[PDB]
Amino acid sequence: KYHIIDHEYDCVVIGAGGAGLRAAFGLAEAGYKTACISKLFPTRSHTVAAQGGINAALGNMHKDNWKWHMYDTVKGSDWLGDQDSIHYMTREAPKSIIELEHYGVPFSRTENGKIYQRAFGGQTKEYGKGAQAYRTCAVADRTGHALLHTLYGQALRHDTHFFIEYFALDLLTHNGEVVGVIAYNQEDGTIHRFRAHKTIIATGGYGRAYFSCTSAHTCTGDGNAMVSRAGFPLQDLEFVQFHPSGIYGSGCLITEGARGEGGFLVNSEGERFMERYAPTAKDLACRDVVSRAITMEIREGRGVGKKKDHMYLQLSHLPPEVLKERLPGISETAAIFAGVDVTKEPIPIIPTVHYNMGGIPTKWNGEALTIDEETGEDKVIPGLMACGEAACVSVHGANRLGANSLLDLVVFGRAVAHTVADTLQPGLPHKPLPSDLGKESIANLDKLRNANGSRSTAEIRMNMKQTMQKDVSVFRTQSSLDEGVRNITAVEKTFDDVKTTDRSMIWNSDLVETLELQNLLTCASQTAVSAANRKESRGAHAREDYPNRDDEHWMKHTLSWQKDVAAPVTLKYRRVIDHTLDEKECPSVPPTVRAY
Amino acid sequence: LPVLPQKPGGVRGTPNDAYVPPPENKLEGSYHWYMEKIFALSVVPLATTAMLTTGPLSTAADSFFSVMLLGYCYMEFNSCITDYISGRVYGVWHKYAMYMLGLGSAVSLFGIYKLETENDGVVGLVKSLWD
Amino acid sequence: MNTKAAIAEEQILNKQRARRPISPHLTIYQPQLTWYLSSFHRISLVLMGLGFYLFTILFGVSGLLGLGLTTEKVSNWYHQKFSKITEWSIKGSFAYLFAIHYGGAIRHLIWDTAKELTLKGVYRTGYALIGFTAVLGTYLLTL
Amino acid sequence: TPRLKTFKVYRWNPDEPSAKPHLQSYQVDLNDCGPMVLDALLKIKDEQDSTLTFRRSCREGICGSCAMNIGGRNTLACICKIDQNESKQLKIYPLPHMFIVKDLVPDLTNFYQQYKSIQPYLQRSSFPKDGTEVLQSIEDRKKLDGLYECILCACCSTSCPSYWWNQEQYLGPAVLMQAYRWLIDSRDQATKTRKAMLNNSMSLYRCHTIMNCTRTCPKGLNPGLAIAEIKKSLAF
Ligand SMILES: *Cc1cc2c(cc1C)nc1c(=O)[nH]c(=O)nc-1n2C[C@H](O)[C@H](O)[C@H](O)COP(=O)(O)OP(=O)(O)OC[C@H]1O[C@@H](n2cnc3c(N)ncnc32)[C@H](O)[C@@H]1O
Ligand SMILES: CCCCCCCC/C=C/CCCCCCCC(=O)OC[C@H](COP(=O)(O)OCCN)OC(=O)CCCCCCC/C=C/CCCCCCCC
Ligand SMILES: CON(C(=O)c1cn(C)nc1C(F)F)[C@@H](C)Cc1c(Cl)cc(Cl)cc1Cl
Ligand code: SF4
Ligand code: F3S
Numbered sequence A: 001k002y003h004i005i006d007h008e009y010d011c012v013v014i015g016a017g018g019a020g021l022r023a024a025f026g027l028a029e030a031g032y033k034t035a036c037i038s039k040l041f042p043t044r045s046h047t048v049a050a051q052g053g054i055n056a057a058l059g060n061m062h063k064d065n066w067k068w069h070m071y072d073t074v075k076g077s078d079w080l081g082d083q084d085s086i087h088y089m090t091r092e093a094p095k096s097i098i099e100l101e102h103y104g105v106p107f108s109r110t111e112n113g114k115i116y117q118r119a120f121g122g123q124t125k126e127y128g129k130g131a132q133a134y135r136t137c138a139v140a141d142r143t144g145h146a147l148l149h150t151l152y153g154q155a156l157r158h159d160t161h162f163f164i165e166y167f168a169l170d171l172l173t174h175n176g177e178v179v180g181v182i183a184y185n186q187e188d189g190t191i192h193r194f195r196a197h198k199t200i201i202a203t204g205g206y207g208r209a210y211f212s213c214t215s216a217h218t219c220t221g222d223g224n225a226m227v228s229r230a231g232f233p234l235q236d237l238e239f240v241q242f243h244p245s246g247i248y249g250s251g252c253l254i255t256e257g258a259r260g261e262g263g264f265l266v267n268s269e270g271e272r273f274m275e276r277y278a279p280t281a282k283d284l285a286c287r288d289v290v291s292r293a294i295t296m297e298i299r300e301g302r303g304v305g306k307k308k309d310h311m312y313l314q315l316s317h318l319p320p321e322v323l324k325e326r327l328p329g330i331s332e333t334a335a336i337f338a339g340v341d342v343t344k345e346p347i348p349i350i351p352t353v354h355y356n357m358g359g360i361p362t363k364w365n366g367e368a369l370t371i372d373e374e375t376g377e378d379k380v381i382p383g384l385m386a387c388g389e390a391a392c393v394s395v396h397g398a399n400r401l402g403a404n405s406l407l408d409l410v411v412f413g414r415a416v417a418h419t420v421a422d423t424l425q426p427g428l429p430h431k432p433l434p435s436d437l438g439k440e441s442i443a444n445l446d447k448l449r450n451a452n453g454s455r456s457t458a459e460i461r462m463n464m465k466q467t468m469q470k471d472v473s474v475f476r477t478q479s480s481l482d483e484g485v486r487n488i489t490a491v492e493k494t495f496d497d498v499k500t501t502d503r504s505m506i507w508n509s510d511l512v513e514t515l516e517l518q519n520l521l522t523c524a525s526q527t528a529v530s531a532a533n534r535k536e537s538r539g540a541h542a543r544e545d546y547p548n549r550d551d552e553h554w555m556k557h558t559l560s561w562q563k564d565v566a567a568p569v570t571l572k573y574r575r576v577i578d579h580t581l582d583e584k585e586c587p588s589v590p591p592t593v594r595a596y
Numbered sequence B: 001l002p003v004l005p006q007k008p009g010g011v012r013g014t015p016n017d018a019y020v021p022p023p024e025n026k027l028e029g030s031y032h033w034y035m036e037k038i039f040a041l042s043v044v045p046l047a048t049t050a051m052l053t054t055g056p057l058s059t060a061a062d063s064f065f066s067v068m069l070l071g072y073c074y075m076e077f078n079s080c081i082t083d084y085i086s087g088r089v090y091g092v093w094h095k096y097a098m099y100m101l102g103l104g105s106a107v108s109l110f111g112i113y114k115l116e117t118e119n120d121g122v123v124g125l126v127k128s129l130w131d
Numbered sequence C: 001m002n003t004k005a006a007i008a009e010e011q012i013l014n015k016q017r018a019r020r021p022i023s024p025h026l027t028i029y030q031p032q033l034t035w036y037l038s039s040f041h042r043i044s045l046v047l048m049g050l051g052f053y054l055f056t057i058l059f060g061v062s063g064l065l066g067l068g069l070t071t072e073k074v075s076n077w078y079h080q081k082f083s084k085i086t087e088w089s090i091k092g093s094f095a096y097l098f099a100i101h102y103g104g105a106i107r108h109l110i111w112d113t114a115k116e117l118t119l120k121g122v123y124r125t126g127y128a129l130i131g132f133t134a135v136l137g138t139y140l141l142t143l
Numbered sequence D: 001t002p003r004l005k006t007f008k009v010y011r012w013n014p015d016e017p018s019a020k021p022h023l024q025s026y027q028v029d030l031n032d033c034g035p036m037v038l039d040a041l042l043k044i045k046d047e048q049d050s051t052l053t054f055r056r057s058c059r060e061g062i063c064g065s066c067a068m069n070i071g072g073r074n075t076l077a078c079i080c081k082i083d084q085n086e087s088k089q090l091k092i093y094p095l096p097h098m099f100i101v102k103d104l105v106p107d108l109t110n111f112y113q114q115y116k117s118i119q120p121y122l123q124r125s126s127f128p129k130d131g132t133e134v135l136q137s138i139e140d141r142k143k144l145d146g147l148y149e150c151i152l153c154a155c156c157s158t159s160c161p162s163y164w165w166n167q168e169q170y171l172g173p174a175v176l177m178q179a180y181r182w183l184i185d186s187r188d189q190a191t192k193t194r195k196a197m198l199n200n201s202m203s204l205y206r207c208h209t210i211m212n213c214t215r216t217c218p219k220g221l222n223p224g225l226a227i228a229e230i231k232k233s234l235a236f
């Protein structure tokens, strides 16, 4: 028997990354009483690994209006992004970086004393017909590193109650509304109950459901599985972005900023990727036209390798004074894990899982959505909000543009703090509920702790990662996808005989890594169902059997429901927004054929 | 020595409290850092012009050397008291060992008065037991 | 009186905080040249400081408790108690404990102006000290 | 032919606290492992004893969560290479002189309370008029290099003998470099209050310049030079 401890707040934020930290002192400054439950220390998250930039139209180099920035985001998304969150993110993009410089983010500076901006791929000028524009606004090659350590320091200026190393288990729902979250103290072994009015989820992606991913070790989907256990849908789970710059074996990442400054991929034959399997734009293109330019190139026997299945990216043409000033982080990362050289000899390259352009469906102001059972229209869940990588605002749509994911955290963490300030009065009585609230999520903690079966936790986790790499690949068809749904159901039925050796409550790291396996099977049994039910080729979802893009029948998102593991998955759809927040301020952009 | 009751495990509270610093007390802060460098810049040259000579030092020059060498040996034991006999653990037995260095360094100043007027000097004593 | 009942958290955590051990700090750390040469600097001044507070208090108490003690009478009492080894064990140990504190004091003068504080200069003004205690230390032993 | 090392891991178990902390030894097949120590600590947890507890997040060396004592020095366990030698062994310890929670997990609670006291945020008073950013020249930007790249791993604090004993009062070399990052920032109009919490007996002046911290920093920083630049700042 466990003893529960009760808390009582106004707004509970789950997660302390880049968009959970921005929405934590955004609400504790307005006059509320917040809490920021985290599993790690705040400057340990996955947003410390970001090394690109934050795209903004600040002006400091050449000339740039945010309306050019908006068209480059809709064109690089295959018109699946809602064209009013694009209008809202790029309009509040110059205002959100100047506010980040006043907090104390040490930016690289130019000759007159303004912020330094490099160039990335996809972003042009003069509405797609022009040159490469310089809008990246970046701090050498440690941009995500110097962004947490400023946002965490500013979060200590205002009184925010951080709850470090608390594993959150499930959501608390009474008659179809979220009234708080139940957590688990790792240092002590006590069960806590947080009660609030507006619960905000910023947990992050589910990248660790695959075999070779670039994500962290803790980067599992615990926000998308807490929502799916309550009976609420997830949106666009079949768009997974594959990176073309992942090291063999380990899965680590070299940035595409090296390709933005003159990185050239050299295959075994030494011929350049321009006309064989490549678009007219050489290397500064989307993240999917180059991964398809690599996945079939190593298959056709043109790449380097002992097993002929990798590449290398040349950085030797640059001057030595340009590497050691702009990218010192890659000069030490490829010297340890790859272990040949960075400057005089190139480094191996494999396609790895990078980013997830899906999750909880929200609006442009942060509040989550579901659909009505008979009319098919949207509906707002009362209390549940979401922001960051674990929320599908569809700013990225079908393909995330380069370095738009750090602008995603700053703008849509700032907007979450503003919409609670328009609805919630500071200081309100909480309704009396029964004391058995959350008793169905403590009995799951005890069933996975007193376990005795035939398979261990590290044996079932190898059958899931191996299955998701073979079948849900870069190239998919309707003969291996239907075997990928059939195999992922067979691994979930063997979760009833999982085995756990540690029977303590103080730092049971065998329990915590078993609850992360229960959350991964819920985000992996809906990716395989949704990917085998879209007969189309857009974005990062390329079907071999249906090689044509649809603008008449398949311009709609995909919602999915699944209660627990070993339970059937259903699907419904919702319509994509094609209008703007205001017609006179910016006109809408009509769909054309996408070609770079 | 007796030991004051300590914090249970090193810390008391949550990671979002703060360590409130003691106020500015410059006579053991930056001004104590001046006196440790004045005495250490005066025993380095004077010990060099006491190894190059060939006999007893001049009686006015030796008193300057033998009172700068007491400050260099008092400021050392002031740091071995503050590091090991702290006031967290022992309490009032930190300022009792500081008082023992009080009348153990003023009687040691009387010994320099009975060495430069009667005998030849401090460095004359060290040459006498040879080395 | 709902969140100020988090003092029921401090009464269960502080019973678990009393059974925690301390990890070993000495006897597992590897020997480096940073924390060895800085230990012989503080060992040198403690032993030579006790050899300065025990020869000056002796003349100070004789000035108040009247006995009379010339340096000749001290020398004839110190040269008779010991002989051979002891006099060549005190003389050989204290002569090397003075050269490592003389070269140590000049080393800490450079480090207090924020010079030679790179990792290259720490191992450069530390190798020139080890040879220095083997040259000037023996010259004080033939005198 | 399998090669076997012998990893010796410090072990404690809090629900049986009457037992004493001892070392347990495993035989890791060296062919089926990675080239790092973290890759040989996860293989023990899966195919062998699963009650081994430790912290790991990113396997890259930029998070600062695998801080332990491998071989005698303090380093990060995801970037330390294993000696390819099946004859010699290896001893894995936690950070020295910390209160140990379970196995290799210290209690870094005093370390987080000390980082909050140095006020790590910008304290400017009057911003620009038109609403743009704050001007800062390039030579004033170059002063910050080598100071903002710290990852807060506390491998330099738990190697200093002056911090081993007096850790409830002395801030340590990891915090005192972050008190220097805000002292030489050009856009900071509050510096007469930062040099008033270090002007007592034990916040800064327990540094005896026994430079272990610079020796065992796995990012190549200089936390010992940035303390002897504060002492010149308070004096002159
Ligand atoms: C992995 C990666 C991503 C990346 C990148 C390079 C790498 C290696 N480079 C980028 C770049 O150059 N430009 C760019 O625009 N984006 C780049 N990215 C992507 C980007 O970094 C991420 O998408 C983004 O930073 C994610 O941030 P978010 O705030 O969404 O999430 P997080 O940083 O992972 O933090 C989540 C926190 O949630 C807490 N948590 C998680 N689960 C729980 C549970 N169960 N209970 C309690 N708390 C929980 C964690 O503490 C975590 O800190
Ligand atoms: C055993 C003495 C007990 C009294 C003091 C306790 C020990 C203090 C240190 C004793 C060991 C080092 C001092 C003596 C070693 C020097 C060798 C020596 O004295 O032999 C006699 C020799 C005679 O030769 P000269 O004719 O003078 O030179 C001819 C020039 N060509 O004298 C000398 O070498 C020079 C005398 C050295 C005086 C140094 C003063 C020692 C007292 C130190 C107390 C604490 C000081 C701390 C360090 C000070 C420097 C930072
Ligand atoms: C690293 O050396 N040791 C220090 O403890 C130290 C040395 N310095 C310069 N500073 C410190 C720190 F404690 F402040 C210890 C290990 C040795 C030591 C001890 Cl245990 C006791 C004494 Cl009296 C002298 C000495 Cl040599
Ligand atoms: S300054 Fe160095 S030793 Fe200290 S936490 Fe940072 S990397 Fe570690
Ligand atoms: S080892 Fe310690 S004494 Fe100073 S030089 Fe480093 S903080």
Ligand code: FES
Pocket (backbone or CB within 6 Å): D056, D057, D058, D059, D060, D061, D062, D063, D064, D065, D066, D076, D077, D078, D079
């Ligand atoms: S685990 Fe991230 S640094 Fe070793």
